[PDB]
């Protein structure tokens, strides 16, 4: 599956590259998150600007340039080639949606960009861009520990690596953030060890190693105690993406989630929700686990009138812009 074609940005300036490296780079301006930069003609150019909400590290603007299309997501709005658009916006090859808890931009054969709109932002890239990319997401060559931080044969540090991939505005001179002093707190109560190493991610231990995630959990624990679950959610995403099936680690206290009345919050539910518009969509799907709201098995989602999830036998039909409740009939002159 999406083994090594994923990168992400989460929590307190935590960057996970394509080949598994995690680091922290507390920048506060624009950076080349990824760019087709080892080819005759560029295909994609995705950048992030990271700012602050009071104190929480957030992404304040993303600019994805791809194949003559400019997509700027910021301020809860999306700009397509300079024009605001209402989600979802679909065109040949490109589709952008408010799907789930995020804003997702999928450019077919190019990339998949998930953006929760506050902190996280995840890139899936095609295998064909192996070794031809460069940015905070890494080189996509498959070797984690040897080729990212070696510029002109000199091994360099996360601050250095995140500052090399910098890009100022036309009239802007953003500084470089200085190294943060030593850490404290750690995982005292063991919450990171209790959860991350808990049963919920058992097989996830067989796929994605949690050492960096453990450290990031501790570091976030040094930050506010209402923001420690970003690392957990990111580990769930990564375990799902490597191929494994995460389990529901959430509890009414562990960053609880709320969903509509008929609709439940699941970790690793099928991404193709069966909806009695296409009640057998989930038949031969090919897509890994996805977190979000779902319906209990047996009852499909009702997208025709948005009445929650309904049983297969009680949901409406549609004909020519008309919605028909169950029990209704309409007769044409011939049928």
């Amino acid at each position: 599956a999406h083994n090594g074609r994923v990168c992400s940005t989460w929590g307190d300036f935590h960057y996970k590259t394509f080949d598994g490296d995690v680091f922290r780079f507390p920048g506060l301006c624009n950076y080349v998150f990824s760019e087709h930069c080892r080819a005759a003609y560029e295909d994609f150019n995705v950048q992030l600007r990271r700012g602050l909400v009071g104190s929480r590290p957030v992404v304040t603007r993303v600019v994805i340039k791809a194949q003559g299309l400019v997509l700027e997501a910021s301020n809860g709005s999306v700009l397509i080639n300079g024009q605001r658009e209402e989600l979802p916006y679909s065109r040949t090859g490109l589709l952008v949606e408010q799907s789930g808890d995020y804003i997702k931009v999928s450019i077919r054969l190019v990339l998949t960009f998930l953006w929760n709109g506050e902190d996280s932002a995840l890139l899936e890239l095609d295998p064909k861009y192996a070794n031809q990319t460069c940015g905070l997401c890494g080189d996509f060559n498959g070797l984690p520990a040897f080729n990212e931080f070696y510029a002109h044969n000199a091994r360099l540090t996360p601050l250095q690596f995140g500052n090399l991939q910098k890009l100022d505005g036309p009239t802007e001179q953003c500084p470089d953030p200085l190294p943060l002093p030593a850490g404290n707190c750690t995982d005292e109560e063991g919450i990171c060890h209790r959860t991350l190493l808990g049963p919920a991610f058992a097989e996830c231990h067989a796929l994605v190693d949690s050492t960096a995630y453990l450290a990031a959990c501790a570091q976030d624990l040094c930050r506010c105690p209402t923001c420690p679950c970003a690392t957990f959610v990111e580990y769930s995403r990564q375990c799902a993406h490597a191929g494994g099936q995460p389990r529901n680690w959430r509890c009414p206290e562990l960053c609880p989630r709320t969903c509509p009345l008929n609709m439940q919050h699941q970790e690793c539910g099928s991404p193709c929700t069966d909806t009695c518009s296409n009640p057998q969509r989930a038949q031969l799907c090919e897509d890994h686990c996805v977190d979000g709201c779902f319906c209990p098995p047996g009852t499909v989602l009702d997208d025709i009138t948005h009445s929650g999830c309904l049983p297969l036998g009680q949901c409406p039909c549609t004909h020519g812009g008309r919605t028909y409740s169950p029990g209704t009939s309409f007769n044409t002159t011939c049928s």
Partner: protein
């Protein structure tokens, strides 16, 4: 000059001093006007009368950023008399005579160094070549040659023989292919790294850089713009490409942008057009940053009016250079040895190097003298 006769234009040529230039730290316009880009990091022999070692203008181009194609000019080292003399103009304005700091002006061995304005430095020599070096907003170089040296020079700026196909003649007797391949034969130090050909336009990187550079550099080719007066004389397409490439690639986008616009203006004024008032809503931080008591001027076409000069003449003001713009004292004012700008009434006449205050009657050698309006008069 062309006369309308015989149903045609009968054209004769007045002698024309050739003009090399390095603009943006990367682009080079040679004597044959073969514009080419050079992204190198070494000292390059900008020009040299390659029969002898009479003069040798050197330029040190230095990489200024993350990208290998981010260069700035950093020095101009006129070697002379086969290396016996070396006038080195840096990028901050510091002028080193034989590797020793030397303020400006300086007049010795027929060499005259002076600043027409705060933006430019003039290194005039009697050997034939004149250097006019720009410091504001960044470092650019211009070279003028008395046409006598036609078809004799070597170096980056080409042999000056009115042929654009021979400009890449190397020392091996063949025309080189591209810019960088030609330049890497003229490096000063064997240890330098060879320049590399650059296809990737930095303009494609940032959309905000895109729109900024486009909206400003488009002021060149606008037929209603101040620059239109030179369009019918100089084709502004290379200058627009330079402005685009600079601003997109320049970390200080405004600096390289205004450098490109200044370069276009200065080239056109070299051809004999007085482009004026082109900084509308652009590059005005170069209006304001002037030294105190000075002021901007668009047509600075002579020496700088000085109290010493009006008192006892000056070798400086006997040099003809293309009218550059920059910061100077306004007309009717002069800068004393202190450098402050005062009217003529406040600055003194100087006799034998003695400060003789204005409006002061004195006795000397059986004579009575007066200092009226900075002017010295003596009677008896």
């Amino acid at each position: 000059s062309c006369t309308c006769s015989g149903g045609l234009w009968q054209c004769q040529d007045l002698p024309c001093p050739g003009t090399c230039s390095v603009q943006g730290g990367a682009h080079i316009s040679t004597y044959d006007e073969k514009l080419y880009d050079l992204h190198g990091d070494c000292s390059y022999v900008l020009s040299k009368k390659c029969a002898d070692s009479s003069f040798t203008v050197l330029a040190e181009l230095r990489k200024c950023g993350l990208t290998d194609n981010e260069n700035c000019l950093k020095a101009v080292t006129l070697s002379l008399d086969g290396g016996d003399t070396a006038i080195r103009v840096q990028a901050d304005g510091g002028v080193f005579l034989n590797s020793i700091y030397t303020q400006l002006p300086l007049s010795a061995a027929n060499i005259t160094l002076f600043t027409p304005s705060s933006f430019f430095i003039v290194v005039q020599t009697g050997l034939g070549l004149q250097l006019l070096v720009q410091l504001v907003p960044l470092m650019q170089v211009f070279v003028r040659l008395d046409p006598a040296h036609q078809g004799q020079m070597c170096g980056l700026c080409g042999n000056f023989n009115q042929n654009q196909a021979d400009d890449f003649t190397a020392l091996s007797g063949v025309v080189e292919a591209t810019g960088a391949a030609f330049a890497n034969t003229w490096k000063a130090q064997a240890a330098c790294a060879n320049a590399r050909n650059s296809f990737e336009d930095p303009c494609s990187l940032s959309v905000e850089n895109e729109n900024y550079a486009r909206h400003w550099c488009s002021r060149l080719t606008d037929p209603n713009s101040a620059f239109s007066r030179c369009h019918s004389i100089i084709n502004p397409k290379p200058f627009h490409s330079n402005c685009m490439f600079d601003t997109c690639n320049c970390e200080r986008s405004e600096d390289c942008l205004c450098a490109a616009l200044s370069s276009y203006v200065h080239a056109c004024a070299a051809k004999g057009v007085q482009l004026s008032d082109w900084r509308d809503g652009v590059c005005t931080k170069y209006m304001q940053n002037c030294p105190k008591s000075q002021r901007y001027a668009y047509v600075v076409d002579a020496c700088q009016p000085t109290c010493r000069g009006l008192s006892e003449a000056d070798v400086t003001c006997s040099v003809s250079f293309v009218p550059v713009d920059g910061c100077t004292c306004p007309a009717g004012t002069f800068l004393n040895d202190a450098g402050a700008c005062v009217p003529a009434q406040e600055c003194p006449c100087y006799a034998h190097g003695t400060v003789l205050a204005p409006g002061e009657v004195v006795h000397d050698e059986g004579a009575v003298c007066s200092c009226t309006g900075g002017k010295l008069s003596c009677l008896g």
